[PDB]
Amino acid sequence: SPQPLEQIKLSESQLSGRVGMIEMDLASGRTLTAWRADERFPMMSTFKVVLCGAVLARVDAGDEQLERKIHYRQQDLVDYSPVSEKHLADGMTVGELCAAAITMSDNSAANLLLATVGGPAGLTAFLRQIGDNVTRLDRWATELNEALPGDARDTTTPASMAATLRKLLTSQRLSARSQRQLLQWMVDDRVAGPLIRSVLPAGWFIADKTGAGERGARGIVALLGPNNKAERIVVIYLRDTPASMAERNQQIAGIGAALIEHWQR
Ligand SMILES: OC[C@H]1O[C@H](O[C@H]2[C@H](O)[C@@H](O)[C@H](OCCCCCCC3CCCCC3)O[C@@H]2CO)[C@H](O)[C@@H](O)[C@@H]1O
Numbered sequence: 233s234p235q236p237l238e239q240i241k242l243s244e245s246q247l248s249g250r251v252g253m254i255e256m257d258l259a260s261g262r263t264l265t266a267w268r269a270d271e272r273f274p275m276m277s278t279f280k281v282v283l284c285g286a287v288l289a290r291v292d293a294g295d296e297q298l299e300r301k302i303h304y305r306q307q308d309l310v311d312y313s314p315v316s317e318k319h320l321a322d323g324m325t326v327g328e329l330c331a332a333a334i335t336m337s338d339n340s341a342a343n344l345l346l347a348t349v350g351g352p353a354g355l356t357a358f359l360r361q362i363g364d365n366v367t368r369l370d371r372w373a374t375e376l377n378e379a380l381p382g383d384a385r386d387t388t389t390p391a392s393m394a395a396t397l398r399k400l401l402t403s404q405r406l407s408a409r410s411q412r413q414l415l416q417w418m419v420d421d422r423v424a425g426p427l428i429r430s431v432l433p434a435g436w437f438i439a440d441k442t443g444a445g446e447r448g449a450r451g452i453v454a455l456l457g458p459n460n461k462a463e464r465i466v467v468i469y470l471r472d473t474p475a476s477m478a479e480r481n482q483q484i485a486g487i488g489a490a491l492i493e494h495w496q497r
């Protein structure tokens with residue numbers, strides 16, 4: 233594979249779309265690679281990690297409990313609810329809802345949690361509270377993935393998302409237990425995690441949340457590193473490409489390969 237920036241450029245050329253990327257040291261925030269890092273991209277399902285950071289903040293404040301059971305109705309369900317559709321009779325705890333939202337990308341679980349933090353506006357206010365003045369959630373799950381050109385709704389920037397994830401995972405804004413919980417939910421991703429491990433060389437750590445949307449939107453927020461350590465945050469977003477899902481996945485994997493082969497920078 234070529235150097236990271238050369239591979240990122242190659243991916244735009246091959247996809248005819250925009251790629252946004254940040255590679256950042258998790259412990260210090262040192263930015264290593266930045267490409268269109270201040271440009272907007274639809275967050276898609278990656279917003280679910282920030283959502284659960286807001287839930288954990290409420291738990292830390294004593295305004296929520298991960299144990300609290302939420303009972304919901306079938307009419308509350310939206311498209312793609314693999315875990316929540318199985319619990320109409322018994323409900324799910326707030327912690328179970330975050331696990332379903334992050335590890336299975338369950339949309340009804342995400343919406344139930346979104347209401348607890350004040351909806352899209354409440355989550356956006358939380359982002360402003362932690363110093364992210366760019367990321368914004370405007371719609372509920374299912375409609376936030378529309379990815380219309382020029383539409384600023386439900387977007388982030390690679391730089392903003394990377395800084396926000398670092399703040400949630402390591403800045404001590406969340407309690408120690410909450411920081412550990414958010415990380416474990418990403419480690420536990422069932423949608424892409426196992427697949428990524430299957431193609432990663434031995435010794436590489438992965439934790440992640442992926443997303444997909446219209447007009448080719450695709451993305452991933454991840455922790456990656458050799459020696460089985462979450463050394464870096466890597467955020468990659470793609471937008472406005474007509475390519476197949478398989479090729480969008482292949483290009484993101486290609487950028488990851490370039491990082492792996494040329495890690496010491
Ligand atoms: O010299 C480095 C390595 O080069 C190859 O590894 C390949 C691997 O066989 C391939 O499967 C992967 O594809 C990349 C898979 C990446 C998948 C997800 C990437 C995500 C993760 C973080 C956020 C953004 C992208 O590339 C590496 C590096 O060339 C060799 O197979 C391996 O033995 C060797 O240790």
Ligand SMILES: *C(=O)/C=C/N[C@@H](C(=O)O)C(C)(C)S(=O)O
Pocket residue numbers: 276277278311312337339373374375376377442443444445
């Ligand atoms: C998160 O990225 C979700 C992606 N897609 C879903 C969505 O809510 O937009 C569907 C319903 C389109 S499907 O799961 O792809």
